[PDB]
Write an enzyme that holds these catalytic residues in place. Structure first.
Site, mmCIF file in Angstrom:
data_model
loop_
_atom_site.group_PDB
_atom_site.id
_atom_site.type_symbol
_atom_site.label_atom_id
_atom_site.label_comp_id
_atom_site.label_asym_id
_atom_site.label_seq_id
_atom_site.Cartn_x
_atom_site.Cartn_y
_atom_site.Cartn_z
ATOM 1 N N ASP A 73 0.936 -1.245 -0.287
ATOM 2 C CA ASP A 73 -0.197 0.569 0.386
ATOM 3 C C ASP A 73 0.578 1.204 0.174
ATOM 4 O O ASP A 73 0.703 2.131 -0.772
ATOM 5 C CB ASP A 73 -0.489 -0.103 1.479
ATOM 6 C CG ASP A 73 -2.355 -0.891 1.349
ATOM 7 O OD1 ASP A 73 -2.904 -1.385 -0.152
ATOM 8 O OD2 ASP A 73 -2.529 -1.553 2.079
ATOM 9 N N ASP A 89 1.448 -2.141 4.497
ATOM 10 C CA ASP A 89 0.788 -2.887 3.930
ATOM 11 C C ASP A 89 -0.563 -2.824 4.852
ATOM 12 O O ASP A 89 -0.690 -2.919 6.695
ATOM 13 C CB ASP A 89 0.461 -4.464 3.252
ATOM 14 C CG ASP A 89 0.016 -4.618 2.104
ATOM 15 O OD1 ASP A 89 -0.281 -3.598 1.655
ATOM 16 O OD2 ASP A 89 -0.686 -5.747 1.277
ATOM 17 N N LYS A 91 -4.061 -4.534 6.860
ATOM 18 C CA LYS A 91 -4.736 -5.185 6.929
ATOM 19 C C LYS A 91 -6.057 -5.583 7.511
ATOM 20 O O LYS A 91 -5.770 -4.723 8.385
ATOM 21 C CB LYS A 91 -4.058 -7.062 7.290
ATOM 22 C CG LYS A 91 -3.058 -6.975 6.099
ATOM 23 C CD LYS A 91 -3.507 -7.288 4.360
ATOM 24 C CE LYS A 91 -2.367 -7.349 3.688
ATOM 25 N NZ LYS A 91 -3.346 -8.149 2.358
HETATM 26 MG MG LIG Z 1 -4.171 -2.051 1.224
#
Ligand SMILES: [Mg+2]
Ligand SMILES: [Mg+2]
Ligand SMILES: [Mg+2]
Ligand SMILES: [Mg+2]
Lengths: 244, 244
Positions: A73, A89, A91
């Site tokens: 990300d 990232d 989640k």
């Molecule tokens: Mg993402």
DNA sequence: AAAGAT
DNA sequence: ATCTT
DNA sequence: AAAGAT
DNA sequence: ATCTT
């Protein structure tokens, strides 16, 4: 450090603000839905401003993927240290009752960890850290969300789609488990534990090198796995055997 | 009709309102990202109140899935005619410049269309219509401004992640194509055409019955399709010869 | 769990 | 939930 | 495209 | 993008 500052900022922001709707430039507010499909997207957007604020404070450039199905990300790095990139990232998952065990799908195990440049913004070897910012929300009992709109003056009457939310930041390898998190989409599954364990980092792998080796050699179907390994114990026995 | 009203309402709402961020109960606004992951979520939320408003005007009940992996986004039906339900699913895709060809992933072809009660809120045979509300947005390059938070008095200053948005309502079978829209997640692909073709309904199937039969017998891999059919022409020749 | 849904 | 090559 | 990424 | 059985 960047890490300690990011963690403090995430806790603070999450504790002070509750997201309740999408707003149009005209001032009309559309309420939210209670499924993870909606909340995973919201929590990711809620995080962007924080990450960028802290990153800039430390002299880090923040980059997002150009191709939509690329990891991570956010890619953070100092222009002077191009090979010391940090991957972040986000989640999301849920719980019905605050004291239950949770698990996350942590990303694929057949892409960049097996192929240095597959579906990743920068070659895998340029990243020295892979952090996961995880959000866990408690679902609301009512399976019927609001089906009308609101205006700025009604902000306090808008029902929130979650009862509560918890966030943590942790290294991916530390919270990784030994069982796949999805079938057809071949995802790494996280440990199935309580929130506290993710924060404190009580994982199952001995090192990041063990985490990587385990997932780079994990087979897709149980049929193929039964002759190799299906869990950490069997993986270690497989190492003893001479990797055959 | 319910259909003509719904189309008019969606078309109208879409021109008069522009979503620009998510708002917190405390009044803080977070900007939107520019990829489909974000916009598909926003467009669904945007559509909810409109659908419910028009449905109520025609005496229809509107129900959303109780479980996350169930189709459709919205089930409409009058209390007096439970076996004449309408399914509405929202689909989104993007375009880089206006007037390019687009295509959507229309849902699975191995679930409820092959098994009457699999992953669907109500048994497939209770639905008399399956409508797709599709959104197409022109993607716009994210800037540094979209990385900070805003306040209510700054609504007009928040940069929007889309250049233009077009919407249409059409029957699923009418816009369904003959090639899969995804591999591992086995999705029906829509026709690959310009927006006007979706509005007008210029597809490839002659009837809903042909669409159903085609997709109920479509094989998952090209290897398995080599001896059967890979497109609409081959499917018709296959039918002609007696399905052998 | 594994496999296959969204 | 849908995208990429 | 088909196959496999998110 | 994760979830369900
Ligand atoms: Mg993402
Ligand atoms: Mg993505
Ligand atoms: Mg769903
Ligand atoms: Mg939907």
């Amino acid at each position: 450090s960047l890490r300690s500052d990011l963690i403090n900022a995430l806790y603070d922001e999450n504790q002070k603000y509750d997201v309740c709707g999408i707003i149009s430039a005209e001032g009309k507010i559309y309420p939210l839905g209670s499924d993870t499909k909606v909340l995973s997207t919201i929590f990711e957007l809620f995080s962007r401003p924080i990450i960028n604020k802290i990153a800039e404070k430390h002299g880090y450039i923040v980059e997002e993927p150009k191709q939509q199905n690329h990891y991570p990300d956010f890619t953070l790095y100092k222009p002077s240290e191009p090979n010391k990139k940090i991957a972040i990232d986000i989640k999301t998952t849920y719980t019905n009752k605050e004291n239950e065990k949770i698990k996350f799908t942590l990303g694929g195990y057949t892409s960049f960890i097996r192929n240095n440049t597959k579906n990743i913004v920068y070659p895998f070897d340029q990243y020295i850290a892979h952090w996961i910012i995880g959000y866990v929300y408690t679902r609301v009992a009512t399976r019927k969300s609001s089906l009308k709109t609101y205006n700025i003056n009604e902000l306090n009457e808008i029902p929130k789609p979650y009862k509560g939310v918890k966030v943590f930041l942790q290294d991916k390898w530390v919270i990784a488990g030994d069982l796949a998190g999805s079938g057809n989409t071949t995802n790494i599954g996280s440990i199935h534990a309580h929130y506290k364990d993710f924060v404190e980092g009580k994982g199952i792998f001995d090192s990041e090198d063990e985490f990587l080796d385990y997932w780079r050699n994990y087979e897709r179907t149980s049929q193929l796995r039964n002759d190799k390994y299906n869990n950490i114990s069997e993986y270690r026995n497989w190492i003893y055997r001479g990797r055959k």
